[PDB]
Symmetry: D2
């Protein structure tokens, strides 16, 4: 029935955004990528040069179909928020309509209303620092980019979404339990995001009949995950998860993708405001073996 999904936060094929795209594509949902301007050019070149073709293979019966690929920066709500420096920066200078409001408008003009929205991004300048050593600026950066970006995303996309639409984001259990090394206010940011998902579920539910949930994912060696280490963090997390989770299988990006796909579909019609753990059951453990 022409399901269309905007995925905010893909920069290569190694993260959760790609797994989500892949699983949605299997269900025939049309995909639009929102790509952060620092990685946008290299994403487009790699794509054009066929570097992603193997990764786009669904089952060798089918391959992913990408409707569109758009520059997107979740730091900026509207054109008026973009500082002169950023506007003129080498990587931004050749790009247009990349703020949250502008991408919503652009999508609406080209394709009309959509019914699925994925927030799959996060950022924090001081992620390598422990919370106690994080500055005011660095903490506010984490909240701005990782948490506020969801609210803003919702604010502007609800106008271009049909009733009974669905929105998902991605979170991590460090919001609820202590993960040393998940620094820079990222733990704080995921805690805010999980709480905001409830408040948004209430308002979007009553005022638009739109659902919103978040997926608390287990560890995946994405490009962003690698950046967490100082002086690795993700290696430890993965090793620990595969050794101690109730389910010992390797956690795949498409494992999250298939849950995202369910949550974005009408099958999850009575679920909203929730944090859903897709982490091989690791979250349930207290004492290891």
């Amino acid at each position: 029935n022409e399901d269309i999904c905007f995925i905010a936060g893909i920069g290569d094929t190694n993260g959760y955004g790609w797994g989500i795209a892949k699983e949605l594509s299997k269900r025939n949902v049309k995909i639009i990528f929102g790509i952060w301007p620092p990685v946008y050019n290299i994403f487009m070149k790699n794509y054009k040069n066929g570097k992603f073709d193997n990764d786009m293979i669904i089952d060798k019966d089918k391959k992913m179909n990408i409707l569109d690929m758009l520059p997107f920066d979740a730091s900026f709500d509207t054109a008026n928020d973009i500082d002169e420096e950023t506007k003129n920066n080498k990587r931004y200078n050749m790009l247009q309509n990349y703020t949250i409001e502008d991408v919503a408008n652009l999508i609406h003009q080209k394709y009309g209303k959509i019914n699925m929205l994925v927030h799959s991004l996060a950022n924090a300048k001081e992620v390598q620092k422990d919370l106690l050593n994080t500055s005011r600026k660095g903490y506010l950066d984490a909240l701005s980019k990782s948490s506020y970006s969801l609210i803003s995303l919702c604010k502007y996309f609800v106008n271009i979404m049909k009733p009974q639409s669905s929105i998902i984001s991605l979170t991590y259990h460090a919001s609820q339990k202590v993960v040393p090394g998940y620094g820079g206010g990222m733990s704080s940011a995921k805690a805010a995001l999980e709480s905001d998902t409830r408040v948004l579920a209430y308002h979007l539910g009553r005022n638009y009949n739109i659902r919103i949930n978040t997926i608390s994912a287990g560890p995946l060696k994405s490009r962003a995950a690698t950046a967490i280490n100082k002086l690795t963090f993700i290696d430890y997390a993965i090793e620990y998860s595969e050794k101690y989770a109730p389910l010992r299988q390797k956690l795949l990006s498409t494992d999250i993708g298939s849950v995202a796909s369910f949550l974005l579909s009408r099958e999850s019609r009575a679920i909203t405001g929730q944090t859903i753990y897709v982490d091989n059951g690791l979250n349930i453990m207290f004492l290891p073996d």
Copy 2:
């Protein structure tokens, strides 16, 4: 060839039926576990076509029911049945309805299965507040509503394939106070949600089998009507205050169940998943 056993169907008005309907959409073969005191009433209504409209999925298909068997979650094995039950008019003409007996019967008739649904509860003192519940009444609630899941798992894992999946149904009274949800049902649900985690660990590590529980919102089922207009209140409150105003349907729980029982959810286990139009997230009635 997916097969699901659904323990706890008494008519077409509860969550078991909605779960059956939705699994039927995905062409899963369904086997009903029916409490013996209502087994013959159910079979008669079924034979008489009372459930026919309720069995329609759409233009294409109609529910495919593989089998319907008497099943009593009060009893683990044949040895556990008391004489009063043996001498009951409703039980005396039935056989092989203990938890172990039904596992053996299903396995003998159809081989290994890969989906298991616990959709049952009982508490002989549900109408009393917790403080006025007796020891026998409280332990009955836990026996029928909580331990029954553990025993179901114990006997059914042997007849299940690797990567199988199990769900039960719970209610948010385990976590926040619902006056009226009495007789130790709130306790039973708290135990069920906790047991779901412990079972998830053991079943996952030993068998690669998953187990989850769905925390459902209110539905005007037969069991619900037995709690003391309680259900009319809960439904009215939910439809007034839940983030989503839609009427909650048994098939809304059914489609979540179907997802949790399928391989699409291979990385989810030990979880309480809320399917209640968001009501659980609210604090202050607006």
Copy 3:
């Protein structure tokens, strides 16, 4: 004239004793409820001065023990005792040890009390994993460890003053998986924490009485030693990974209990309070 009944003291090595010591600091009169199979051993050790050093509070004072009574949380009333127990060598020389009988005895001897501590648990199959626990074993855990709180409340409220306060002890295995905490103890604790909320509502509205539960970290008590080196592991893990490295003492739980039982906490009820050096907040062992 504050009086506290402490149900579940068997020696000086568990949390009941630590709670007794701390309440004694505040000059609360303490009455011990002692499980009959260990009642005479306890009385003999006490008479023989084995507990004397353990009774010292400081330079000033020593624990003031008002009374010590046999108490069995298995039985609500005299009628509930089975003949095998009646004919037991340890029970036959004792009397008035059912929950109701002890409430009546305390009230007759000393009048109304204002503090109640449930510091007991039992599970006959604690050494089995949940999946291998039988119905009788699982219901025993719930009967002795969970329902006992409800019944304690039921019978003791009549002998308590308005604004009285009640606590029990739980463990984080109710909420997160602890392999080894078997026999349905994890289930019993989940039910206990849930029941604490439901009881809080009813006791608060009807009697202005508060009830809370303390989720304690590991202590090398007699009961703990019976779980299967499990306790040595938990202690070692806790002292290695808890935010606070201090050794957890029974009196660390005792001073929290004393606060929860006093009027300083008049606005706290229905809560699970973690007294475990912060261990529960951790996800990833650093």
Copy 4:
């Protein structure tokens, strides 16, 4: 044994800061007030003129003793963070050493090391707006003033605190469950604060043997609470609490104070990283009557 407590966030006698001061004073703890510069002058005048004397009465046996009263703005980590405008603002111009670091230094110089710390402040420019209508600036303001201020407070005060010291803040259940009207990112901010309390408990515990907890308080008609209403919010909350809480008594500021006092004392030695509800049990309810 000369217990000394710094209370960050008092501006009159109607809030939780005053109840906390009163209960601590009963235990003979010496109190130092950190007073936000916009209300500081009026606080000092009222005090000098004896306007608080009745409110300082403990039991007519005893009256509160306040060791010191210091201008304090939790927006600023160090002197170097203060913008020229604020430095020169009418209400700030005559005040000195009011940043987090400067007050810590000042306290240390005058009285040596302390052992108790209370964060009893919050702020959010757009509190009257629902989350969806909150701007990026307004949301970041809520997190900065209500959440980051705790981390910073901890960072600078740990150097002037003894081992086995204790720190508390105040939070509200809107972090966990939806409270329509608790707007501007305050819900997000309390969610971050509750999560930060865990991460801080871990680091302060291991590296300083210092405890930190937060109290999730029920509704109290403080000056700040009144400011929440638009176009009242607190009236509704109070009425609802007294009608539906397990305990029907009126919730008092000193009810929180006596819990704060316990948590700050050695009696709570094995408790850290926790959210403790002091709300007459309201949080435990699902369905009202």
